[PDB]
Amino acid sequence: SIVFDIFNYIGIVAFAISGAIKAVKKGMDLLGVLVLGFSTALGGGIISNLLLGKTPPTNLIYYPYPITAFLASLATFVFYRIFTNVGKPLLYADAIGLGAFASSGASLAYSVSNNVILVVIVGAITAVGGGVIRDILSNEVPLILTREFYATTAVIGSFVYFIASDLSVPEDVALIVSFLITLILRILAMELKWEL
Template identity: 65%
Template sequence: MSLVLELANYVGITAFGISGSMKGIRKGMDLLGVLTLGFSTALGGGIIADVLLGIMPPTNLVYLPNALVALLASLFTFIFYKVFTNVNKPLIYADAIGLGAFASSGASLAYSVDPSPLLVIMIGTITAVGGGVIRDILSNEVPLILTREFYATSVIIGSGIYFVLRYEGMSNYYDIFISFVITTTLRIMAIKMRWELPRILHS
Protein backbone atom coordinates (compact mmCIF):
# COMPACT_ATOMS: atom_id res chain seq x y z
CA MET A 1 0.00 0.00 0.00
CA SER A 2 2.85 2.40 0.79
CA LEU A 3 4.24 1.67 -2.69
CA VAL A 4 0.97 2.85 -4.26
CA LEU A 5 1.13 6.11 -2.32
CA GLU A 6 4.79 6.60 -3.17
CA LEU A 7 4.03 6.16 -6.86
CA ALA A 8 1.11 8.59 -6.52
CA ASN A 9 3.48 11.05 -4.89
CA TYR A 10 5.83 10.94 -7.88
CA VAL A 11 2.90 11.22 -10.29
CA GLY A 12 1.90 14.37 -8.42
CA ILE A 13 5.41 15.82 -8.44
CA THR A 14 5.63 15.20 -12.18
CA ALA A 15 2.21 16.66 -12.95
CA PHE A 16 2.76 19.72 -10.77
CA GLY A 17 6.24 20.22 -12.22
CA ILE A 18 4.81 20.18 -15.74
CA SER A 19 2.01 22.53 -14.70
CA GLY A 20 4.43 25.08 -13.29
CA SER A 21 6.77 24.80 -16.26
CA MET A 22 3.92 25.27 -18.75
CA LYS A 23 2.89 28.43 -16.92
CA GLY A 24 6.47 29.71 -17.04
CA ILE A 25 6.76 29.03 -20.75
CA ARG A 26 3.46 30.80 -21.46
CA LYS A 27 4.73 33.78 -19.47
CA GLY A 28 7.86 33.95 -21.63
CA MET A 29 10.33 32.89 -18.93
CA ASP A 30 13.77 31.55 -19.79
CA LEU A 31 15.05 28.08 -18.84
CA LEU A 32 15.95 29.10 -15.29
CA GLY A 33 12.55 30.71 -14.81
CA VAL A 34 10.76 27.62 -16.11
CA LEU A 35 12.79 25.30 -13.87
CA THR A 36 12.16 27.55 -10.88
CA LEU A 37 8.42 27.66 -11.49
CA GLY A 38 8.22 23.91 -12.08
CA PHE A 39 10.24 23.09 -8.96
CA SER A 40 8.25 25.54 -6.82
CA THR A 41 4.91 24.19 -8.03
CA ALA A 42 5.90 20.58 -7.45
CA LEU A 43 7.61 20.91 -4.07
CA GLY A 44 6.78 24.35 -2.67
CA GLY A 45 3.74 23.22 -0.69
CA GLY A 46 5.70 20.52 1.10
CA ILE A 47 8.52 22.93 1.87
CA ILE A 48 6.12 25.46 3.42
CA ALA A 49 4.44 22.70 5.43
CA ASP A 50 7.77 21.46 6.81
CA VAL A 51 8.81 24.98 7.81
CA LEU A 52 5.50 25.50 9.65
CA LEU A 53 5.99 22.17 11.46
CA GLY A 54 9.57 23.02 12.41
CA ILE A 55 11.13 20.35 10.19
CA MET A 56 14.47 21.81 9.17
CA PRO A 57 15.85 21.58 6.61
CA PRO A 58 12.65 20.77 4.67
CA THR A 59 12.51 17.24 3.30
CA ASN A 60 12.06 18.37 -0.32
CA LEU A 61 15.40 20.20 -0.13
CA VAL A 62 17.42 17.25 1.15
CA TYR A 63 15.64 14.18 -0.28
CA LEU A 64 17.14 14.20 -3.77
CA PRO A 65 14.63 11.90 -5.60
CA ASN A 66 11.82 14.45 -5.11
CA ALA A 67 13.93 17.35 -6.32
CA LEU A 68 15.30 15.33 -9.23
CA VAL A 69 11.85 14.29 -10.46
CA ALA A 70 10.60 17.88 -10.22
CA LEU A 71 13.56 19.29 -12.14
CA LEU A 72 13.51 16.58 -14.81
CA ALA A 73 9.77 17.06 -15.35
CA SER A 74 10.37 20.79 -15.76
CA LEU A 75 13.31 20.30 -18.11
CA PHE A 76 11.43 17.83 -20.32
CA THR A 77 8.49 20.23 -20.45
CA PHE A 78 10.80 23.01 -21.60
CA ILE A 79 12.38 20.82 -24.30
CA PHE A 80 9.16 19.12 -25.48
CA TYR A 81 6.73 21.95 -24.85
CA LYS A 82 4.62 21.28 -27.98
CA VAL A 83 4.08 17.67 -26.93
CA PHE A 84 2.73 18.67 -23.52
CA THR A 85 0.25 21.12 -25.02
CA ASN A 86 -1.55 18.10 -26.54
CA VAL A 87 -1.84 16.04 -23.35
CA ASN A 88 -3.77 18.48 -21.20
CA LYS A 89 -6.52 16.09 -20.09
CA PRO A 90 -4.24 13.28 -18.82
CA LEU A 91 -2.24 15.90 -16.89
CA ILE A 92 -5.41 17.12 -15.17
CA TYR A 93 -6.09 13.63 -13.86
CA ALA A 94 -2.44 13.14 -12.89
CA ASP A 95 -2.74 16.43 -11.00
CA ALA A 96 -5.78 15.01 -9.14
CA ILE A 97 -3.77 11.93 -8.12
CA GLY A 98 -0.94 14.12 -6.86
CA LEU A 99 -3.38 16.30 -5.01
CA GLY A 100 -4.69 13.28 -3.10
CA ALA A 101 -1.21 11.97 -2.36
CA PHE A 102 0.07 15.33 -1.09
CA ALA A 103 -3.03 15.98 1.01
CA SER A 104 -2.92 12.61 2.78
CA SER A 105 0.84 12.67 3.36
CA GLY A 106 0.72 16.24 4.66
CA ALA A 107 -2.16 15.44 7.00
CA SER A 108 -0.32 12.38 8.29
CA LEU A 109 2.85 14.36 8.94
CA ALA A 110 0.92 17.05 10.80
CA TYR A 111 -0.87 14.48 12.97
CA SER A 112 2.46 12.94 13.96
CA VAL A 113 3.57 16.38 15.23
CA ASP A 114 0.34 17.32 17.02
CA PRO A 115 -3.10 15.65 16.75
CA SER A 116 -4.93 18.94 16.28
CA PRO A 117 -7.75 18.95 13.69
CA LEU A 118 -6.99 22.48 12.51
CA LEU A 119 -3.27 21.72 12.15
CA VAL A 120 -3.92 18.48 10.26
CA ILE A 121 -6.37 20.08 7.82
CA MET A 122 -4.27 23.21 7.28
CA ILE A 123 -0.99 21.35 6.72
CA GLY A 124 -2.69 18.79 4.46
CA THR A 125 -4.13 21.63 2.40
CA ILE A 126 -0.92 23.65 2.26
CA THR A 127 1.09 20.59 1.21
CA ALA A 128 -1.31 19.90 -1.65
CA VAL A 129 -2.08 23.38 -2.99
CA GLY A 130 0.78 25.55 -1.71
CA GLY A 131 2.91 24.93 -4.78
CA GLY A 132 0.12 26.06 -7.08
CA VAL A 133 -0.29 29.25 -5.07
CA ILE A 134 3.45 29.95 -5.37
CA ARG A 135 3.23 29.30 -9.13
CA ASP A 136 0.41 31.80 -9.59
CA ILE A 137 2.01 34.47 -7.39
CA LEU A 138 5.34 34.19 -9.24
CA SER A 139 3.34 34.48 -12.47
CA ASN A 140 1.67 37.66 -11.20
CA GLU A 141 -1.81 36.09 -11.10
CA VAL A 142 -4.50 35.67 -8.46
CA PRO A 143 -4.08 32.08 -7.14
CA LEU A 144 -6.31 29.73 -9.10
CA ILE A 145 -7.64 28.02 -5.97
CA LEU A 146 -9.24 31.31 -4.85
CA THR A 147 -11.10 32.00 -8.06
CA ARG A 148 -12.43 28.80 -9.58
CA GLU A 149 -13.16 25.10 -9.31
CA PHE A 150 -13.66 22.59 -6.50
CA TYR A 151 -9.93 22.19 -5.91
CA ALA A 152 -8.74 23.14 -2.44
CA THR A 153 -12.14 22.14 -1.06
CA SER A 154 -11.54 18.50 -1.99
CA VAL A 155 -8.21 18.67 -0.15
CA ILE A 156 -9.80 20.17 2.96
CA ILE A 157 -12.40 17.39 3.01
CA GLY A 158 -9.78 14.68 2.42
CA SER A 159 -7.49 16.02 5.15
CA GLY A 160 -10.42 16.25 7.56
CA ILE A 161 -11.36 12.65 6.84
CA TYR A 162 -7.79 11.60 7.55
CA PHE A 163 -7.95 13.27 10.96
CA VAL A 164 -11.26 11.57 11.86
CA LEU A 165 -10.01 8.13 10.80
CA ARG A 166 -6.72 8.49 12.66
CA TYR A 167 -8.41 9.94 15.75
CA GLU A 168 -10.81 7.01 15.82
CA GLY A 169 -7.87 4.62 15.93
CA MET A 170 -7.50 3.41 12.35
CA SER A 171 -3.95 2.27 11.68
CA ASN A 172 -1.64 4.46 9.65
CA TYR A 173 -1.41 3.69 5.90
CA TYR A 174 -5.08 2.66 5.84
CA ASP A 175 -6.17 6.13 6.93
CA ILE A 176 -3.68 7.69 4.51
CA PHE A 177 -4.90 5.50 1.67
CA ILE A 178 -8.59 6.24 2.32
CA SER A 179 -7.88 9.98 2.53
CA PHE A 180 -5.93 9.76 -0.73
CA VAL A 181 -8.74 7.92 -2.52
CA ILE A 182 -11.46 10.30 -1.29
CA THR A 183 -9.50 13.46 -2.16
CA THR A 184 -8.61 12.16 -5.61
CA THR A 185 -12.16 10.96 -6.28
CA LEU A 186 -13.69 14.27 -5.22
CA ARG A 187 -11.31 16.17 -7.50
CA ILE A 188 -12.03 13.90 -10.48
CA MET A 189 -15.77 14.18 -9.88
CA ALA A 190 -15.41 17.96 -9.71
CA ILE A 191 -13.62 17.92 -13.07
CA LYS A 192 -16.25 15.73 -14.73
CA MET A 193 -19.27 17.50 -13.20
CA ARG A 194 -17.74 20.99 -13.23
CA TRP A 195 -18.36 21.68 -9.56
CA GLU A 196 -17.66 25.19 -8.37
CA LEU A 197 -18.21 27.01 -5.10
CA PRO A 198 -20.73 29.90 -5.02
CA ARG A 199 -19.46 33.31 -6.01
CA ILE A 200 -20.87 36.82 -6.39
CA LEU A 201 -20.98 37.90 -10.01
CA HIS A 202 -20.62 41.60 -10.76
CA SER A 203 -22.47 43.06 -13.70
Protein backbone atom coordinates (compact mmCIF):
# COMPACT_ATOMS: atom_id res chain seq x y z
CA SER A 1 0.00 0.00 0.00
CA ILE A 2 1.07 3.58 -0.63
CA VAL A 3 0.75 4.65 3.02
CA PHE A 4 3.02 1.81 4.17
CA ASP A 5 5.69 2.85 1.66
CA ILE A 6 5.36 6.53 2.61
CA PHE A 7 5.59 5.79 6.34
CA ASN A 8 8.86 3.91 5.79
CA TYR A 9 10.41 7.03 4.26
CA ILE A 10 8.92 9.34 6.89
CA GLY A 11 10.28 7.15 9.68
CA ILE A 12 13.73 6.87 8.11
CA VAL A 13 14.00 10.64 7.60
CA ALA A 14 12.67 11.47 11.06
CA PHE A 15 14.95 9.07 12.93
CA ALA A 16 17.97 10.07 10.82
CA ILE A 17 17.34 13.71 11.81
CA SER A 18 17.01 12.72 15.48
CA GLY A 19 20.24 10.72 15.41
CA ALA A 20 22.17 13.38 13.51
CA ILE A 21 20.91 16.05 15.95
CA LYS A 22 22.06 13.93 18.90
CA ALA A 23 25.53 13.60 17.34
CA VAL A 24 25.74 17.35 16.65
CA LYS A 25 24.89 18.05 20.30
CA LYS A 26 27.57 15.55 21.34
CA GLY A 27 30.22 17.46 19.42
CA MET A 28 30.77 14.87 16.68
CA ASP A 29 31.99 15.89 13.24
CA LEU A 30 30.54 15.17 9.81
CA LEU A 31 31.30 11.46 9.48
CA GLY A 32 30.37 10.69 13.09
CA VAL A 33 27.09 12.56 12.58
CA LEU A 34 26.39 10.39 9.53
CA VAL A 35 27.13 7.21 11.53
CA LEU A 36 24.64 8.02 14.29
CA GLY A 37 21.93 9.25 11.93
CA PHE A 38 22.30 6.20 9.67
CA SER A 39 22.18 3.83 12.66
CA THR A 40 19.15 5.48 14.28
CA ALA A 41 17.24 5.56 10.98
CA LEU A 42 17.75 1.90 10.07
CA GLY A 43 18.18 0.13 13.41
CA GLY A 44 14.51 -0.39 14.22
CA GLY A 45 13.75 -2.01 10.87
CA ILE A 46 16.80 -4.26 11.11
CA ILE A 47 15.92 -5.42 14.62
CA SER A 48 12.32 -6.00 13.55
CA ASN A 49 13.45 -8.00 10.51
CA LEU A 50 15.62 -10.29 12.65
CA LEU A 51 12.81 -10.96 15.13
CA LEU A 52 10.49 -11.97 12.28
CA GLY A 53 13.04 -14.16 10.49
CA LYS A 54 13.36 -11.82 7.48
CA THR A 55 16.95 -11.96 6.26
CA PRO A 56 18.73 -10.17 4.79
CA PRO A 57 16.95 -7.15 6.32
CA THR A 58 15.07 -4.87 3.93
CA ASN A 59 17.07 -1.85 5.14
CA LEU A 60 20.27 -3.53 3.89
CA ILE A 61 19.05 -4.61 0.43
CA TYR A 62 16.45 -2.05 -0.74
CA TYR A 63 18.66 0.82 -1.95
CA PRO A 64 16.28 3.80 -1.39
CA TYR A 65 16.12 3.18 2.38
CA PRO A 66 19.84 3.53 3.29
CA ILE A 67 20.24 6.24 0.63
CA THR A 68 17.43 8.17 2.33
CA ALA A 69 19.04 7.66 5.75
CA PHE A 70 22.38 8.94 4.45
CA LEU A 71 20.95 12.01 2.71
CA ALA A 72 18.74 12.95 5.67
CA SER A 73 21.69 12.74 8.08
CA LEU A 74 23.88 14.77 5.71
CA ALA A 75 21.20 17.44 5.30
CA THR A 76 20.89 17.67 9.09
CA PHE A 77 24.65 18.09 9.53
CA VAL A 78 24.87 20.83 6.89
CA PHE A 79 21.85 22.64 8.33
CA TYR A 80 23.28 22.86 11.83
CA ARG A 81 26.82 23.53 10.60
CA ILE A 82 25.44 26.77 9.15
CA PHE A 83 22.63 27.56 11.63
CA THR A 84 24.40 26.73 14.87
CA ASN A 85 21.96 28.55 17.17
CA VAL A 86 18.56 27.46 15.85
CA GLY A 87 16.55 24.96 17.85
CA LYS A 88 17.27 21.22 17.61
CA PRO A 89 13.94 19.36 17.95
CA LEU A 90 15.33 15.90 18.67
CA LEU A 91 12.25 14.69 20.55
CA TYR A 92 9.84 15.97 17.87
CA ALA A 93 11.79 14.14 15.13
CA ASP A 94 11.89 11.03 17.31
CA ALA A 95 8.13 11.27 17.94
CA ILE A 96 7.29 11.44 14.23
CA GLY A 97 9.51 8.42 13.66
CA LEU A 98 7.84 6.61 16.56
CA GLY A 99 4.44 6.98 14.89
CA ALA A 100 5.67 6.02 11.42
CA PHE A 101 7.39 2.85 12.66
CA ALA A 102 4.91 1.74 15.34
CA SER A 103 2.31 1.61 12.56
CA SER A 104 4.41 0.15 9.74
CA GLY A 105 6.24 -2.20 12.11
CA ALA A 106 2.95 -3.52 13.47
CA SER A 107 1.84 -4.03 9.85
CA LEU A 108 4.89 -6.16 9.06
CA ALA A 109 4.40 -8.30 12.17
CA TYR A 110 0.67 -8.72 11.45
CA SER A 111 1.53 -10.07 7.99
CA VAL A 112 3.59 -12.76 9.73
CA SER A 113 0.95 -13.79 12.30
CA ASN A 114 -2.34 -12.62 13.90
CA ASN A 115 -0.81 -12.96 17.40
CA VAL A 116 -1.67 -9.79 19.33
CA ILE A 117 1.42 -10.16 21.52
CA LEU A 118 3.77 -10.49 18.54
CA VAL A 119 2.14 -7.59 16.68
CA VAL A 120 2.07 -5.23 19.67
CA ILE A 121 5.59 -5.99 20.94
CA VAL A 122 7.40 -6.21 17.59
CA GLY A 123 5.59 -3.06 16.49
CA ALA A 124 6.76 -1.23 19.61
CA ILE A 125 10.32 -2.54 19.20
CA THR A 126 10.31 -1.34 15.58
CA ALA A 127 9.21 2.09 16.80
CA VAL A 128 11.63 2.59 19.69
CA GLY A 129 14.50 0.40 18.49
CA GLY A 130 16.42 2.97 16.46
CA GLY A 131 16.30 5.51 19.27
CA VAL A 132 17.37 2.88 21.80
CA ILE A 133 20.46 2.11 19.70
CA ARG A 134 21.09 5.87 19.36
CA ASP A 135 20.93 6.38 23.13
CA ILE A 136 23.07 3.31 23.91
CA LEU A 137 25.76 4.41 21.45
CA SER A 138 25.56 7.92 22.96
CA ASN A 139 26.19 6.25 26.36
CA GLU A 140 23.09 7.57 28.13
CA VAL A 141 19.94 6.08 29.69
CA PRO A 142 17.50 5.76 26.76
CA LEU A 143 14.17 7.53 26.32
CA ILE A 144 12.30 4.24 26.87
CA LEU A 145 13.38 4.55 30.53
CA THR A 146 13.66 8.32 31.11
CA ARG A 147 10.30 9.22 29.49
CA GLU A 148 7.48 7.63 31.49
CA PHE A 149 4.91 7.44 28.67
CA TYR A 150 7.27 6.87 25.71
CA ALA A 151 7.47 3.08 25.34
CA THR A 152 3.83 2.63 26.35
CA THR A 153 2.72 5.08 23.66
CA ALA A 154 4.50 2.98 21.04
CA VAL A 155 2.74 -0.10 22.47
CA ILE A 156 -0.60 1.73 22.25
CA GLY A 157 0.07 2.73 18.64
CA SER A 158 0.88 -0.82 17.54
CA PHE A 159 -2.15 -2.08 19.48
CA VAL A 160 -4.52 0.31 17.71
CA TYR A 161 -3.08 -0.91 14.40
CA PHE A 162 -3.86 -4.48 15.50
CA ILE A 163 -7.40 -3.58 16.56
CA ALA A 164 -8.07 -1.68 13.33
CA SER A 165 -6.76 -4.53 11.17
CA ASP A 166 -8.72 -7.03 13.28
CA LEU A 167 -11.88 -5.06 12.45
CA SER A 168 -11.17 -5.22 8.70
CA VAL A 169 -10.20 -1.53 8.50
CA PRO A 170 -8.43 -0.87 5.16
CA GLU A 171 -4.66 -0.98 5.53
CA ASP A 172 -4.13 2.65 4.50
CA VAL A 173 -6.60 3.83 7.16
CA ALA A 174 -5.32 1.49 9.88
CA LEU A 175 -1.81 2.87 9.35
CA ILE A 176 -2.97 6.50 9.48
CA VAL A 177 -5.04 6.04 12.65
CA SER A 178 -2.15 4.20 14.31
CA PHE A 179 0.36 6.89 13.32
CA LEU A 180 -1.94 9.72 14.43
CA ILE A 181 -2.71 8.20 17.84
CA THR A 182 0.99 7.59 18.52
CA LEU A 183 2.03 11.09 17.48
CA ILE A 184 -0.84 12.80 19.31
CA LEU A 185 -0.09 10.89 22.50
CA ARG A 186 3.53 12.05 22.29
CA ILE A 187 2.55 15.69 21.64
CA LEU A 188 0.26 15.73 24.69
CA ALA A 189 2.93 14.20 26.95
CA MET A 190 5.54 16.70 25.77
CA GLU A 191 3.30 19.79 25.75
CA LEU A 192 1.36 19.02 28.95
CA LYS A 193 4.57 18.14 30.86
CA TRP A 194 3.31 14.64 31.67
CA GLU A 195 6.93 13.45 31.94
CA LEU A 196 8.40 15.51 34.75
